[PDB]
């Protein structure tokens, strides 16, 4: 109707345990019953993105590296996080509060 959205850009360094989260998404592989976009469902209590970075399960990814993850496979969204070498740059989507 009359309700609009607000976007956030975060920069992370590649973790010793494997960052401190897990990602559900695909073009050929589903989550709910045949999915187009990549969404959050698993968070770790002692990782690098939960304590040092500032990412929550309710934040959801559109773009990774400044690269197009809106229409890709599961292995094609993990190879943007494992191949960058030491520095990974993520773009998230969240709805506007009344106060």
């Amino acid at each position: 109707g009359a309700m609009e959205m607000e976007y956030e850009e975060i920069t992370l360094e590649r973790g010793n345990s494997g960052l401190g989260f897990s990602i559900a998404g695909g073009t050929d592989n589903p989550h709910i019953g045949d999915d187009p976009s990549i969404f959050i469902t698993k968070i770790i209590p002692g990782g690098a993105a939960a304590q040092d970075g500032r990412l929550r399960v309710n934040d959801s990814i559109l773009f990774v590296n400044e690269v197009d993850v809106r229409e890709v496979t599961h292995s094609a969204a993990v190879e943007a996080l494992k191949e960058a070498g030491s520095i990974v740059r993520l773009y998230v989507m969240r709805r506007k509060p009344p106060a």
Partner: peptide, 9 residues
């Protein structure tokens, strides 16, 4: 749920 896997970075 029905078709998932999840275990990623």
């Amino acid at each position: 749920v029905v078709s998932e896997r999840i275990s990623s970075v």
